[PDB]
């Protein structure tokens, strides 16, 4: 038994704001008990308005993102406009399902702006189940990240607290904290955190150091 | 997953929980498991999420082409059969889908259960998913064809609620729909936590 899969790690996260989207990932690429490289981000630019995060089997991460890039140009050529964030998400669902009986071993989270200028996150399983979310963690450390986000962004299990809108600064502080906490415990998550912020002005990039062990 | 539907004098009630899981990990509490095939036809989702979404979205595509070709609404019987014949080709390949096709057509209120094993049956009431056994218990004890509308909404909502209580793999919120003669309506979305506050030995 040759196996066509291998787990290469990676944790991804997206948050939707009122006028922004964040997509964040760690930069470690692993195999077994080894590190391939410390500088292999999992975020990919799709359009000026849309970024995708991918983790899992790296062979599939590469192949799938190159397919998506090709499908976006084809779309633009047939229809004379860039694909919307929502259309990309809908398309990706069909691409993932095309391999239902030999899946892309990839966990995908799309972060971008929708047609009204508002933050949009869409999250996927490997065979293309998806929906829209306010915020979502995926990949290696998702079970570590998600609960704190449920608590702090969703205001869950909290009484007598004003459900205010999520500022970029607070969204940003959260993204750094959950990854730093994941880096303590998940052996796959580390090296560096890469954050993409999507706004109407465009896409900017912050990077913060994580533990190297 | 727990879903249910039933026919009664005033149409067909359709209800579902909103939980999704990957093993024991709760992936979502906000999944829409009732799918709007057209304004007078709903489909429900239990099983593999991608499998249900994909095949029911494909059912919807097909029903719309049908309507454009034939200049009339597809029947509940025909729509459920399109779905059965689509999935039949894939038996034993690992699709996991348990669906109810719910509508109102020239034969009145309509309700078919259709799944990835090949079953397609018509009936008065159904429950489908990991929690279905818990919902059948309460649904069966409260059901009647001559239920008043609000009583029918209460029954559906309680049956799903009780399923969420016993079954680890059901929860989130109960989403309730009503197929009437002039189309379906979305009746309510109630979080299970808010329903627990309310109920009711």
């Amino acid at each position: 038994r040759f196996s066509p899969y291998v787990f290469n790690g990676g944790t991804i996260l997206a948050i939707a704001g009122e006028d922004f989207a964040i997509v964040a990932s760690d930069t470690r690429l692993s195999e077994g008990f080894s590190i391939h490289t410390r500088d292999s981000p999992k975020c990919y630019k799709l359009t000026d308005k849309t970024v995708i995060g991918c983790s899992g089997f790296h062979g599939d991460c590469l192949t799938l993102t190159k397919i998506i890039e090709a499908r976006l140009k084809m779309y633009k050529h047939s229809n004379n406009k860039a694909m919307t964030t929502g259309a990309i998400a809908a398309m990706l669902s069909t691409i993932l399902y095309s391999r239902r009986f030999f899946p892309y071993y990839v966990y995908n989270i799309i972060g971008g702006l929708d047609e009204e200028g508002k933050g949009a996150v869409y999250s996927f399983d490997p065979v293309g189940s998806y929906q829209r979310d306010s915020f979502k963690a995926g990949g290696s450390a998702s079970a570590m990240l998600q609960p704190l986000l449920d608590n702090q962004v969703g205001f869950k299990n909290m009484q007598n607290v004003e459900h205010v809108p999520l500022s970029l600064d607070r969204a940003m502080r959260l993204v750094k904290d959950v990854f730093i906490s994941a880096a303590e415990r998940d052996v796959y998550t580390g090296d560096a955190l890469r954050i993409c912020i999507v706004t109407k002005e465009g896409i900017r990039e912050e990077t913060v150091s994580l533990r190297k062990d | 997953t727990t879903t249910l539907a039933f026919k009664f004098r005033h149409g067909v009630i359709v209800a579902a929980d909103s939980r999704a899981t990957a093993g024991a990990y709760i992936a979502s509490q906000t999944v829409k498991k009732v799918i709007e095939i057209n304004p007078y036809l709903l489909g429900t989702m239990a099983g593999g999420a991608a499998d249900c979404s994909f095949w029911e979205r494909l059912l919807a595509r097909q029903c719309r082409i049908y309507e454009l070709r034939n200049k009339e609404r597809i029947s509940v019987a025909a729509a459920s059969k399109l779905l059965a014949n689509m999935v039949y080709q894939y038996k034993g390949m690992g699709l996991s889908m348990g669906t109810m096709i719910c509508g109102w057509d020239k034969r009145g209120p309509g309700l078919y259960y259709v799944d990835s094993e090949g079953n397609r049956i018509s009936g008065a009431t159904f429950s489908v998913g990991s929690g279905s056994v818990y919902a059948y218990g309460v649904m069966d004890r409260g059901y009647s064809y001559d239920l008043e509308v609000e009583q029918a909404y209460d029954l559906a909502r309680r049956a799903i609620y009780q399923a969420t209580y016993r079954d680890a793999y059901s929860g989130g919120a109960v989403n309730l729909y009503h197929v009437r003669e002039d189309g379906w309506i979305r009746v309510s979305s109630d979080n299970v936590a808010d329903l627990h506050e309310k109920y009711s030995g």
Binding site: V127 | T21, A22, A27, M45, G47, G48, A49, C52, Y169
Partner: peptide, 4 residues
């Protein structure tokens, strides 16, 4: 992947 995920189930309902």
């Amino acid at each position: 992947i995920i189930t309902x």
